[PDB]
Amino acid sequence: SNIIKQLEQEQMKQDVPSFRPGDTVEVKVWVVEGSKKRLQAFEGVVIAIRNRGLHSAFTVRKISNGEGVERVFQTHSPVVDSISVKRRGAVRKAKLYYLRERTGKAARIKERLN
């Protein structure tokens, strides 16, 4: 609509980096415990939706202590403060759910457009 997304244009971040599914991106997120707050890191292979606008999602998968953890992120949230590319990966699919259940199998790296 015209009138919706005028309220969203001010809300979306203009600093979101370019990503594709298959990359091993790293997300720094604000964690508060008391009055004090701290950045926590999270790095893993992404299974990201393409943006639906202000509403957006980056499902990032990482096996940390032997248990697989998949945590989605609103891309335009104030809780997420920095997303970094790190590795650049190449896959054919858009969603890597079939490539999430196997253990110790990693997406490859391609130099360009990935």
Partner: protein, 209 residues
Amino acid sequence: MIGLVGKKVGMTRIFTEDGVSIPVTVIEVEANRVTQVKDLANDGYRAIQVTTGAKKANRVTKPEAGHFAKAGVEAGRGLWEFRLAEGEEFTVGQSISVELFADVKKVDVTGTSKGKGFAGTVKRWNFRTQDATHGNSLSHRVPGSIGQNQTPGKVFKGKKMAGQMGNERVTVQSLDVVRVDAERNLLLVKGAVPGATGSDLIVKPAVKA
């Protein structure tokens, strides 16, 4: 207190600075125009009749055109009326309407529900289906017993059966306002609100508040 009338636009999220991400229903409110003021001498109740919209002036009939032309003119999409208790209002239109919802904290939203039509017992009420497998010839989703044998001999009036679900006024109470903005001409309320998109809503300051 009088409650202004609006049109549903959609739902959006507003991220707070903390990051709480509350849902928001955007209710577009044009400037309400008071058409007729009712007082105890003309009829024993107090109210203002309010129009909102812009009709095409080919679909307006002459009886509505004369009533619009009386007491300050603006063609509108319809007429509504809100009862009033403690104040006094003019017979002309008001200029900006959302600024009286500006100071308030909790609103009360009324609108028509979406038409689910002829819906059965399991969809209309929270009924249970009968079992899917162990026998059950032709009786999975069906209503069960509608009565109590011969001593009543009849079916009671409150008996829940299949019928129309939807297209009724449903009112959500104590809804919390997020913001107002006269220049964007909007009223933003947290969470779910009755209505299809493009349906007219009656937001009032909350009776429980």
